[PDB]
Design a protein around this ligand. Sequence first.
Ligand code: SF4
Ligand SMILES: [Zn+2]
Ligand SMILES: [Zn+2]
Ligand SMILES: [Zn+2]
Lengths: 538, 103, 512, 99, 189, 146, 97
Amino acid sequence: KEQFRETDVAKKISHICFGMKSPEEMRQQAHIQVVSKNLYSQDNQHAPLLYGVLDHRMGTSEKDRPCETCGKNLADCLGHYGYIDLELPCFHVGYFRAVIGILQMICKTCCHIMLSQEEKKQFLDYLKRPGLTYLQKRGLKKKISDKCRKKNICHHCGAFNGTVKKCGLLKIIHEKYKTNKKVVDPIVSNFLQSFETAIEHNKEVEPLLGRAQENLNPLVVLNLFKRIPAEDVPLLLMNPEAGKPSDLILTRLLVPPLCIRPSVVNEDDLTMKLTEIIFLNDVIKKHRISGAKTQMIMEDWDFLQLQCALYINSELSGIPLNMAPKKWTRGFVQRLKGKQGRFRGNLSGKRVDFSGRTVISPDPNLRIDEVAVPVHVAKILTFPEKVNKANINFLRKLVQNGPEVHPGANFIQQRHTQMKRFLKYGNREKMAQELKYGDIVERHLIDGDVVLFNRQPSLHKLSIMAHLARVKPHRTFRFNECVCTPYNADFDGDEMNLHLPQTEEAKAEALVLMGTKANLVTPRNGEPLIAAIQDFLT
Amino acid sequence: AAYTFNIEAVGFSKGEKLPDVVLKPPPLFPDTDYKPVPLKTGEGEEYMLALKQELRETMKRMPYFIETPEERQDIERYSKRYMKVYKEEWIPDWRRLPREMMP
Amino acid sequence: TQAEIKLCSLLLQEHFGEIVEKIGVHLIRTGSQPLRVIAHDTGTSLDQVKKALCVLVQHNLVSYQVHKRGVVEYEAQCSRVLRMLRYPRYIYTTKTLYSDTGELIVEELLLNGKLTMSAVVKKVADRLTETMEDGKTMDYAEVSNTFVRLADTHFVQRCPSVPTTENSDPGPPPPAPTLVINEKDMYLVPKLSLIGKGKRRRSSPIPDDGIYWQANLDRFHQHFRDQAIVSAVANRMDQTSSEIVRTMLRMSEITTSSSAPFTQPLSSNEIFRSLPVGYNISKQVLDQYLTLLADDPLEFVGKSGDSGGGMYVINLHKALASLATATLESVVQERFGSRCARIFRLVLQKKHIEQKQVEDFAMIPAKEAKDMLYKMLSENFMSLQEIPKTPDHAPSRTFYLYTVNILSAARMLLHRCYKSIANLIERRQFETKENKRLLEKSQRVEAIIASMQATGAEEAQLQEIEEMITAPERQQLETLKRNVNKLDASEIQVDETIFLLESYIECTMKRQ
Amino acid sequence: DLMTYKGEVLGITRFGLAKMKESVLMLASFEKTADHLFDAAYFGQKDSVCGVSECIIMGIPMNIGTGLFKLLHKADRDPNPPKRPLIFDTNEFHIPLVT
Amino acid sequence: MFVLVEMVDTVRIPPWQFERKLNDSIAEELNKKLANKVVYNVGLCICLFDITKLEDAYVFPGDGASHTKVHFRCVVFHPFLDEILIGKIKGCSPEGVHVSLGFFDDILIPPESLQQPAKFDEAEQVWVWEYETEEGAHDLYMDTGEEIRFRVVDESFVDTSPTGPSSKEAPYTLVGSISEPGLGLLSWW
Amino acid sequence: DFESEFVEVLNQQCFKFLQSKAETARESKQNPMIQRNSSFASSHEVWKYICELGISKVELSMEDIETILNTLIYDGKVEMTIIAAKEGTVGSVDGHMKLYRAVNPIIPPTGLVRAPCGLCPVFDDCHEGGEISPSNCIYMTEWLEF
Amino acid sequence: TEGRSRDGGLRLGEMERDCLIGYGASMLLLERLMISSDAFEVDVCGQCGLLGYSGWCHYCKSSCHVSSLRIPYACKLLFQELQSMNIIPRLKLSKYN
DNA sequence: TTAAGTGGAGCTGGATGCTCTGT
DNA sequence: TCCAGCTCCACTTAA
RNA sequence: ACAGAG
Ligand code: SF4
Ligand SMILES: [Zn+2]
Ligand SMILES: [Zn+2]
Ligand SMILES: [Zn+2]
């Protein structure tokens, strides 16, 4: 009757292979096409438009309005993508030094790579050895591009190939028609005289015709990169299974889901840049029909090269004065870099719960491995104790005390349910009788819980050790003054942190490895740190 | 509303005649002003068309059309000899072929 | 060359199968590889690699060269697999120029790659029994009489042969025999006194062993290069002007190379005897044509001489540029209108021109010309020059000069044609595959007619064939066949654009 | 020994660390966070999660410390238990039909 | 009429069953997961036949349950092509005859493979078989299911997987035949 | 621009005068060297014909019809040869004179435009399995119908 | 959240992560930074390497390769801030054995 | 005489400590 | 506010 | 954005 299906496919991450998309795998990923520019409808309903940004087919970023692709809330949706078409292509600002890198090696006429036939056999035998590391790859692109830039003629088509270099903000020049004081080459002597009709009406061609070279732009370097042979792609050191050279010039652009850019910041700086990119796809589209000059079309195109650059990195160097931004916005790079980025601010170190912070004060009547937790913090902090055969009589009494008397419990969770009955209400004498095995009682922090303890400038590993908690009626963290040497605490208005581990394995790694009785000596030179101090020596 | 860039560097010196807002996206297949030029006919152009479709049926039958071998047959039966696909096998000139290619 | 590898993925699948195209595409895509890694990087068994390599080394599609340590590497020819599309144009151009025997000689060579002369004269004479009747068999003399006339005109060339191991390196056997071309005996046919009769398929030692013959594809492309030039003159000036062009290129068949900007100069004293005598023309009127064809600024022909009366040359590379221009400007009119092709002819002539001069010189106003300028920079028919005043290269202080480049637009136009044919094959294979229920049902009603056609075939089997439910379904099978016949024919006619484009791209490359 | 195990004295800058460590997220978690990401996109560089700093990002337990070894449970188990004998399809009664 | 199917699987044993021999707890867990279900390409699994190899019982971090990879063999109802079976009828329909085979129920005798002297009913569900001398057009296929003997000619696998995000077709179908002389009801031959 | 509504009719009027004058040279067939010279038209000859036809009230000046015939060159329909003014009825350039003749195109139209792929405005967005695909295209299924 | 006014919660910073490595504490460093901050699961298509939803890869249009994965939410945010930049983080998932 | 490989000089882009507590 | 890479330009050897 | 505290 019913086909077998594997129930829970838990899998482990083996490797991450970075890459890029073709501009028509963006269409296969996204759900809608974004064409409109306005954020909300003009009426008092405050509803988002149907084919612009903040469309809720791409997700949701508030509790009130659900999503439209999956019909699920903010808590459950993984977010969904859209896309934007561009009327003219633009450089991706991240790969711009890689588009120049490909152009310095391939021929600018036949799109083959400027190498001799023997040199291709040398490097493609180097690329067959197993275990090729990422350092060995980045050195090889240096060795290959240095061999291409020593040649000026192609071994396959024979056309001349000059230097390829940057000539301003997001502009690429190719000096095909270089001249010297020597005998003039025949192919450059044709270019300097074929300007005949332009000199007839325009006088200023004559001083400027010597400075005319081939100016590359995303209409042309897109068309060159489609004609690179696939045999000559790994000599550009691009893995052709993760990306192609045609993908470095964007012509279509994914927009992020709405949970990447929440609706109350009102709108995010990424949404406001996506408005200006949609708006410039109508400014260019109108000027191509209403007959603007070539001086205006290029300027509009440049604005679109700038607005897709500031959308990615809003800290460029060579922005012109008439096109510099007035205020500072976040691109994607600024919300990845720095101390307040993702990697340092939200990934390597992040805010945790089941933690406290109080002024400290001394107490020598405790042991060297105990700490005195105030009762106001011991009622808030909870450890989820599972019900089994050894602790059922204890946890029934800790449920019967309830959330207000100290050896008590704040929550209770059924066996195969994910919903926590808040134990302040109901009759706790009934919920204590119904404790089955496998239920979780979230008891308060009691005497004997392994708890971490931390003074904040943490210079060595003994700045955070684990103690055994004891509840006492005042309002400070308290410990024996022999422990004041590793933390470098001094009781002059000092705040230390606390962390209650929430797992049995997190307990046992904290007790065996991180206890005070197992960290008496410093790991630096083997000298004891937990020892006596003033008035215990005197 | 005002943007980050200057509109006056983009254009719009009068301050009016801004482009309209696209409400619905353009269709997948925008209609064409011009049509395909019709094909060339004649007694030469049609015989090549007749010869082309004969080459598909021919080269699919020749033994150079190396089909994929069958597998995962379930049981054996006496009707295998009645279902044996017979076809003559071509053998190359191994003097022209390299030594590493003998079966 | 993503369009080339996509199109070669279809031509290997239709003509050779599926477990050969995985070997065939991988050799085009990556490069020359030894044999052990092709089984690794693709995943087939090592025996199926040897089957797929012996079918690709047969049809002259992959080569092999010995390298260091005696390994053999296989290198595919991407240009050769695309010439499998021009097979019906090859079998027809040997039907116009040669007899129907010679039509079948080229056909057995293109369908087996390499054959001996003794094998092809047997197989053609066997297949010509169907074309004849009434006691007349086909004999091996008149087949070979057509065969040796081909080798005189170089349409069939000898393959590169095996080396003589008794003369060069006797002893240990090499892994690969390292074949080599011999210029002298490419067309020096072996003599065959052995005759016989073609068997009529009744169904009830070799002196040129090793001498394999193959089709010379470079000869046809020299021949097709003529008709592109000859029929161009036939449209411009005159048919008598065209036969003179036809006369000179036929004389230039054996005496020049296939890549020469200027052919051998022929004097007008010997063109006159070379022309067919049906043209009532004098020597002086012959000198009138040669001085008015020299007056053409298209320079199909030139003077290039003074001795021997009227010395004249006919141009080869410059004649292709006049055709590739007409190839490139025929698509600008049909895609963007006649008024847009006025600009594409304007900016081509005046080599660097701006917006204001185009609207003046072509009498097309603003906002209608500028739309026809801007839809061509996005389609890469036309480029800007961008002469700056400052090294800042700011857009508000510079001049944008429009420019049409023939070479960059011809390589672009060729790349569209490869994808254009691959889309036609994909549409045909889509409608063929989705009617696999219709075609097999129409096959089973014909199999009752095909099987038991004469032996015990009663007359009461002709009414149960249309009786099946395929009777209203014949509307779709006729709608099928009118679709397949149009897409196959459009697949052939795009190759006319490829040859006019690829010859111009090939001839402009110095290949140093 | 960490500075001099690649034959050359390497700093503890971002320049010496770019030549020693191979993990991409370890490089991008320290300095020049943008450029390593576009370089790994360009080269198509794949990245294992074997390093310590990207085990912390991806949420899998790290390899040093208590993650170096694997634990087995000592259950009462009999590997390779006595197999059930087939009765019909044994090999001695079913010699094939074809020659 | 069955085949053994050799499979591999990773089985979670929760820690309250560490009192019991692991060879017994695996066999109970694999029968709770594979019984009465049609695996896609191989058919309908009845029960576990035996365990053939039992690898190590790891304990992963974040859990106390022992995971072990199990090699085993499972008995599967999967009749080969052109096999002769015996079974009862479920009923009749204009689409065909529904044949019940004990545990299994989806066996369609198509009207194109019925015995030829009757091919269509008189706007009635119950199918007939017209013999000339005796029982013309009334020899009926009873819905109570007297035993027939049929010959399987076609089997089909439809992939019952979700098409689309989350928030009943028959997966293992079988087409028999009756037109051969000697097939049919056990009374007739 | 002068007028798009005005020069649009001269394109089909001036070409017919270069066609019939080339047609009568084709019907002459006396001497093919002289038949070529019989096809050339004087720039002053073609100008005095169009103003005789009576199209507009405004006078068609010779300096304008000298430039409207260049659009017949740019449409690829006629040629232009400049000869010396050794003898002429006008010889409007000092020492020079122009001559026009109607010609044919070089080739029949290419095979790319006969397929619908060469004319497609969304050619770059078409792939094998996505939304825009040859297996479900409108531009072929229209073209396959007629 | 951040501070005492917002019922914030304290910060295992960059330096306190370095102390827990020195003890060799692996599961405690897992519990602090995954289990008790931002634990989350995603549907991953093991064929194309991209993120899917609800057991449905919209890229491949299938349900035969989707799989669950235990990931911190700030990395799922990273795996969607990188695709908008066109730096695609393609995954390959093996079994957890 | 000049082709070319390598020094020295200027330009460019990157980075600069950990937390809470309030306005 | 300080410091590695990248690129431009004279300066010998060698033919 | 500023001031504090250790
Ligand atoms: S959309 Fe269809 S008709 Fe148009 S180019 Fe693509 S495949 Fe050809
Ligand atoms: Zn959603
Ligand atoms: Zn080149
Ligand atoms: Zn997928």
